[PDB]
Amino acid sequence: VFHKIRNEDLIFNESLGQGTFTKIFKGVRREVGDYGQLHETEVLLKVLDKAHRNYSESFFEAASMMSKLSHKHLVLNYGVCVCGDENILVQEFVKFGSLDTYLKKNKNCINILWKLEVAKQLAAAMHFLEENTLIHGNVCAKNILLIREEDRKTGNPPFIKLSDPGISITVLPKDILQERIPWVPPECIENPKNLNLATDKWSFGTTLWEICSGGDKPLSALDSQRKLQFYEDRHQLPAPKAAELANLINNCMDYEPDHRPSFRAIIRDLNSLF
Numbered sequence: 125v126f127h128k129i130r131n132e133d134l135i136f137n138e139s140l141g142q143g144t145f146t147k148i149f150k151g152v153r154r155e156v157g158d159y160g161q162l163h164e165t166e167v168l169l170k171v172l173d174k175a176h177r178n179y180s181e182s183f184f185e186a187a188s189m190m191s192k193l194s195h196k197h198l199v200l201n202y203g204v205c206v207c208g209d210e211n212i213l214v215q216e217f218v219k220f221g222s223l224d225t226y227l228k229k230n231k232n233c234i235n236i237l238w239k240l241e242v243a244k245q246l247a248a249a250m251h252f253l254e255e256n257t258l259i260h261g262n263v264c265a266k267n268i269l270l271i272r273e274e275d276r277k278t279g280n281p282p283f284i285k286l287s288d289p290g291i292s293i294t295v296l297p298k299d300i301l302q303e304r305i306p307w308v309p310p311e312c313i314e315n316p317k318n319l320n321l322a323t324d325k326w327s328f329g330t331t332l333w334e335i336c337s338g339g340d341k342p343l344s345a346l347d348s349q350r351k352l353q354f355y356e357d358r359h360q361l362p363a364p365k366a367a368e369l370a371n372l373i374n375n376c377m378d379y380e381p382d383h384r385p386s387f388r389a390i391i392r393d394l395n396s397l398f
């Protein structure tokens with residue numbers, strides 16, 4: 125179970141926007157750390173909407189199972205604050221924020237080598253999850269957080285972490301799921317209980333498309349009815365103009381879940397490039 129954090133030890137500062145039934149804030153946590161030393165630590169506070177408190181079990185279940193695993197490319201959760209009427213996840217604050225935002229802001233400056241490094245790191249994280257038979261269920265560029273920027277001067281690559289899953293697609297309303305096409309795979313639109321390890325291979329493909337597409341969101345021009353028909357017609361996403369990962373994207377986004385490559389195979393493919 126999660127460490128319980130007192131509301132009195134948390135200060136809410138600026139809003140970072142809204143997620144799926146959540147409000148996100150930057151905050152400060154006062155804590156006693158190692159050696160009895162007092163700290164004030166920057167934290168990310170995820171607040172489940174009061175109106176959607178029926179989703180709290182899924183909201184926290186997500187975080188919990190993954191926080192039972194420690195991995196360098198997985199975001200650290202510090203604990204929960206369940207004081208009063210609020211349900212709050214207290215998470216590590218990742219300095220450079222979401223990859224999708226970063227891709228759009230720095231697109232002129234991002235090259236294939238940076239992209240490959242980030243893809244490899246994401247694949248490493250997903251391989252670890254696969255090995256542990258843990259389904260993430262919401263792999264996407266917004267849910268990849270940049271801990272550190274590339275520094276050519278020192279040969280340091282960028283470094284990312286994958287955030288928590290959030291409320292499971294197995295409990296979310298149909299209209300939200302449809303809006304999340306083409307991250308949610310076709311079999312999960314058919315039946316959200318089809319959530320499986322193969323789910324994350326599909327979403328990984330979509331995420332690679334994002335990584336190659338400068339922060340663009342695939343199929344954003346299609347309304348929900350048209351996104352449904354896209355899957356009914358068995359279309360694939362267009363190749364990004366920077367096409368180096370296009371074959372890998374299509375191999376991951378295979379309409380037959382059984383044919384989607386293992387993360388081991390994905391990593392081998394990535395290692396074979398530039």
Ligand SMILES: Nc1ncnc2c1ncn2[C@@H]1O[C@H](COP(=O)(O)OP(=O)(O)OP(=O)(O)O)[C@@H](O)[C@H]1O
Pocket residue numbers: 140141142143144146147148168170199215216217218219221222225262266267269287289290291
């Ligand atoms: N750990 C973090 N550190 C720094 N910024 C973060 C962190 N997590 C989220 N953010 C910022 O908060 C914004 C909202 O995040 P996001 O949309 O993932 O919310 P969510 O509650 O996780 O919803 P979903 O389940 O849809 O992902 C993001 O764009 C991101 O920049």
Ligand SMILES: [Mg+2]
Pocket residue numbers: 143266267287288290
């Ligand atoms: Mg998120």
